[PDB]
Each structure stands twice: as structure tokens, then as C-alpha cells.
């Protein structure tokens, strides 16, 4: 009887908590609408996950960018941007009061160049992985790595003398398993109804070209290295050559690199603040699902009891 | 001390881990931990506190509740709760160096224990703000919080469960055997494992020289 009462009380509490969570975002009948991403970006979120991935593609090199587009009053290689944003934001001022930064949100960005040349999937598939941090609404680059199939094969063969990385290789031997999660689609309204599988199309094109190219058998190592959601991925990118300390780099080089990242490449401070806002909003959304799940388990326990 | 009601313990020397398990006809609860290498906080109070995970699998519900909880003074505080679609599996359990499910966490920060510890000037887990500095000892939640499952990978949940809801959740989870008796035995066994394993390591080091 005590178990039935406890389970039913928890179920009622979960129902009330979800009711209050929905009531907070009433806005006189219209539930809160998610933050709107910048032009051309489309965000996808695995349900019940702690991350979201937002993709953009420039068919022309950089001339498709908004900054080069405005100009108001050769067919270079097309560019593909994929930003992985997890739910990790914390206040460094709490652990040590000597740092005057209130928020610190990390999110990764991979840029890949494709044919309309060592950047093409056929020739090493050289891409750039840049980590980004939002500190009090300011995007600064943490590290820039130039990752390639050559590095992927070296890590599996000759990080050490002859049989590279007894640690990376064991991670490859285990590699877990993929669990498809239903994908919710928050994409820029303008692109919300044109194409719904563009990110899958580009991911498939890149994966098939890389797999069928040279370094074919080492492609799985490249995929794990590029894994932006796994701990093995971060450790592999750490085994790779972490970019130079940008503060140690030149002042003008850092200035030009910020220019390239913000204006030319298109990932701007507006995008960074949107990433933080969406990290907040989707955590809010997932809390509702957590409340529903706790209600579900409690009600099932009550029914079986 | 003594084991809780209906629990079997598994531990092997050099693993720095132990997992104690109990299956009820419907539900199955498995609680696992890895005692830190660093010095442990003394049970008397006057160093890493011993924190463990508890997987409660309810086949009827079709979900598994993974509860991040730490024992203090033989008691327990459940700092996190999350849900998993499938039943308990060895891949889900972080028994070996591999983690459980990844890219899922949604725990709502049931407890302001981390906030409470910082008014008593307790250093806590994050010793250095720079992550890469601490990332030297990867694959060790004890000395690398940013990849520590038990420390939430350094993320502070946006929500804090309402106290009247959090206490109800704690009472509900206590019905399956995650009570203060379990926490007391877990802490005692953690100290014993720490001591005996350190003794074995010392013996090996002495023997080589």
C-alpha cells in the first residue's frame, strides 16, 4: 500500500510540475516559440538528447555570405558548416572568484570544402575543426585543428613507432553502437519547407566520397576522430595536433582569423548568442520530457502495484 | 558493517571498482562505483567524496532510471536522475573504462549540494578553470571532471527541481533499496577497497625493488 501511495503521489507531483512548466510559457495562449537561427542555418535535435547540430552550406566559396552579399547603396569550392552544440554551460566565477566571466558555453564547428586539391574527399579530405566559446556573449576560438585522412591513418598505424595508439585502437575495437534518435527540426523559416533532408544528403555525399576514396579502410577512424558527441572523439582530436595557442599567435593573424570566421565564413556573434539561447530553450524543452518520463514511470509502478 | 538486504557485491583487485546488485522479480537495481585514487574524505568528517551510480530497471515501465548519488557520513544525496529507453545492460553500466549511454543527459539538478559546499569553502571537483590543463589525465572522472559522468561533464542544469518534488522523487526511489543503509555500506566498502587495493599496489612496488 505504501508503494502504491508513494508512486501515485510522485505521479501527481510530476503532473502538477509539467502543468506549471507549460503554464510558465503561456504568453496569453501562445506557447513560447524557439529562437530563430540566422539566415540559411537549419538546426536538428535528437529527441531526449543533450545536443543539437546545425548545418549550413554555401554553394559558392564565400561570395554567398551575407557580408559579401550586402554591398548595398572560377567557381571556387563550395563550403559546408556543421556546428555541434551540447548542453554544457557553467559559471567559472563560482569555482574561483578570481575570473570575471559569468557564462562559458562550448560548441564545435567543422568546416569542409567540397568540389563545385587536398580539401576534396578524394585527396585526404582535409577539413578544419574549430572549437568556440561563448563568454558573456562573446565568441572566441579555443582551438583550430586541420584534420585529415592522413592523420586518421597515422593514428591507427604510426602514432607510436609501428603500431599506433594502443589506446585509440582499443577505442576503435569497442566503438559502441549507434542508436537512431527521432530528429526534431528547428530550421530557419525561409528554408523550413524547401528541403528537409539536405543535411542528410550532404553528410551522405561526404561519407561516401571519403569511404570510396583512398584511406578507405581508415575512414572509420576518421569518423570517430570527427565524432563531436563522443568522449573518444575528443580524445582522438587531442591525440591529433591541437592548434597553436591563439593568444600566443600574432595580433594581426588573430585579427584576420576572427575576420574570416565572423564575416567571410559566416559564423558570427549573432550565431553564437543564438547557440546559447537555443541551448537554454532546448534544455527547457527536454525538462518537459523528463517530467513526462517520471510521470510515466510512477504511473506504471502504481498500475502494476 | 553489514550488506543491505538482498545485495551481492562484485569487486576484483586492481579494478578500483565495485558493483553491488539485487534483482526483484519485477525490478532490478545495480549500484556501481570506482573509489578514487586520491585520499578519501574521512567518514568522521574532520579529498574526493565517494559518489556512485544506481541503475533501477523497471521492465513494466520500459525505462531505466540512472541515479547519480553520493554518500556523506553514511547517508546519501541523489544529485541527479535520468531515464533510458531500454532495460539495464552491461554497455549501459559504466563498469569498465567505457561510459554508459552518451549524448542523453537531462537531469534537472535535484539538489543544491554543490552550491551548499561552496559556502563552507570546500574546494570541490574542478581545481583548475582551464579544461585542457585538467585533461592531461583523460578517461578519469575523478581527476578530469569535464569528461566525468558523475560530475555531469561540468554542466550545471538550468532547472533546479522544486523541493516538494525532489523529496517525493527521493522517497519514491528509496523504496527500491537505494536507502541510507545502502549508502553507508557503499561508503564502508569504498574505504575498505581503497585501503586493500593500495596495500596490494604498495606490495607490488616493494617487490620489484
Amino acid at each position: 500500500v505504501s508503494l502504491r501511495t508513494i508512486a501515485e503521489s510522485l505521479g501527481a507531483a510530476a503532473a502538477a510540475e509539467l502543468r506549471a512548466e507549460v503554464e510558465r510559457d503561456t504568453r496569453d495562449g501562445v506557447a513560447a516559440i524557439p529562437p530563430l537561427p540566422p539566415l540559411g542555418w537549419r538546426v536538428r535535435h535528437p529527441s531526449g538528447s543533450n545536443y543539437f547540430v546545425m548545418t549550413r552550406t554555401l554553394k559558392n566559396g564565400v561570395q554567398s555570405a551575407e557580408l559579401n552579399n550586402r554591398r548595398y547603396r572560377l567557381s571556387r569550392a563550395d563550403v559546408h558548416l556543421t556546428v555541434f552544440a551540447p548542453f554544457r554551460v557553467y559559471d567559472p566565477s563560482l569555482h574561483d572568484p578570481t575570473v570575471d566571466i559569468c557564462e562559458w558555453s562550448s560548441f564545435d564547428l567543422v568546416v569542409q570544402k567540397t568540389v563545385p586539391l587536398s580539401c576534396t574527399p578524394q585527396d585526404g579530405a582535409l577539413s578544419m575543426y574549430v572549437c568556440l566559446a561563448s563568454v558573456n556573449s562573446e565568441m572566441r576560438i579555443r582551438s583550430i585543428q586541420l584534420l585529415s585522412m592522413k592523420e586518421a591513418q597515422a593514428l591507427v598505424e604510426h602514432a607510436c613507432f609501428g603500431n599506433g595508439e594502443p589506446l585509440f585502437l582499443e577505442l576503435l575495437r569497442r566503438r559502441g553502437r549507434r542508436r537512431p534518435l527521432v530528429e526534431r527540426r528547428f530550421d530557419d523559416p525561409r528554408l523550413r519547407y524547401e528541403e528537409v533532408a539536405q543535411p542528410q544528403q550532404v553528410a551522405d555525399e561526404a561519407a561516401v566520397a571519403c569511404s570510396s576514396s583512398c584511406y578507405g579502410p581508415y575512414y572509420p577512424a576518421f569518423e570517430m576522430l570527427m565524432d563531436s558527441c563522443g568522449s573518444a572523439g575528443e580524445y582522438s582530436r587531442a591525440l591529433c595536433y591541437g592548434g597553436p595557442y591563439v593568444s600566443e599567435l600574432s595580433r594581426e593573424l588573430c585579427d584576420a582569423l576572427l575576420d574570416y570566421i565572423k564575416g567571410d565564413l559566416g559564423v558570427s556573434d549573432q550565431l553564437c548568442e543564438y547557440v546559447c539561447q537555443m541551448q537554454f530553450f532546448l534544455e527547457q524543452e527536454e525538462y518537459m520530457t523528463w517530467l513526462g518520463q517520471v510521470q510515466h514511470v510512477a504511473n506504471a509502478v502504481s498500475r502494476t502495484a | 558493517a553489514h550488506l543491505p538486504f538482498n545485495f551481492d557485491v562484485c569487486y576484483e583487485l586492481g579494478s578500483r571498482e565495485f558493483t553491488l546488485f539485487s534483482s526483484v522479480g519485477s525490478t532490478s537495481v545495480l549500484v556501481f562505483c570506482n573509489v578514487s585514487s586520491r585520499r578519501l574524505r574521512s567518514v568522521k568528517g574532520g579529498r574526493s567524496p565517494v559518489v556512485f551510480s544506481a541503475f533501477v530497471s523497471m521492465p513494466t515501465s520500459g525505462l531505466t532510471i540512472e541515479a547519480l548519488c553520493c554518500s556523506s557520513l553514511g547517508l546519501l544525496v541523489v544529485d541527479g536522475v535520468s531515464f533510458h529507453q531500454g532495460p539495464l545492460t552491461e554497455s549501459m553500466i559504466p563498469q569498465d573504462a567505457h561510459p554508459g549511454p552518451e549524448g542523453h543527459y537531462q537531469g534537472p539538478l535535484l539538489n543544491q549540494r554543490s552550491l551548499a559546499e561552496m559556502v563552507v569553502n570546500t574546494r570541490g571537483c574542478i581545481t583548475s578553470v582551464d579544461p585542457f590543463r585538467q585533461q592531461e589525465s583523460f578517461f578519469d572522472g575523478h581527476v578530469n571532471p569535464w569528461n566525468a559522468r558523475s560530475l555531469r561533464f561540468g554542466h550545471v542544469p538550468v532547472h533546479t527541481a522544486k523541493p516538494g518534488f525532489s523529496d517525493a522523487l527521493c522517497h519514491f526511489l528509496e523504496v527500491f533499496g537505494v536507502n541510507d543503509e545502502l549508502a553507508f555500506f557503499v561508503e564502508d566498502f569504498a574505504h575498505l577497497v581503497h585501503r586493500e587495493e593500495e596495500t596490494a599496489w604498495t606490495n607490488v612496488l616493494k617487490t620489484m625493488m
Binding site: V22, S47, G48, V182, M288, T289, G292, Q293, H296 | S61, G62, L63, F83, Q85
Partner: peptide, 13 residues
């Protein structure tokens, strides 16, 4: 509506 959706995603078996 949200609970029905979550049932569709299968987060509530």
C-alpha cells in the same frame, strides 16, 4: 499534445 508526441517518439513506452 506534447504527451502524445512523446508517445510517438517512443520516449514513453
Amino acid at each position: 499534445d506534447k504527451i502524445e508526441k512523446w508517445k510517438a517518439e517512443g520516449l514513453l513506452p
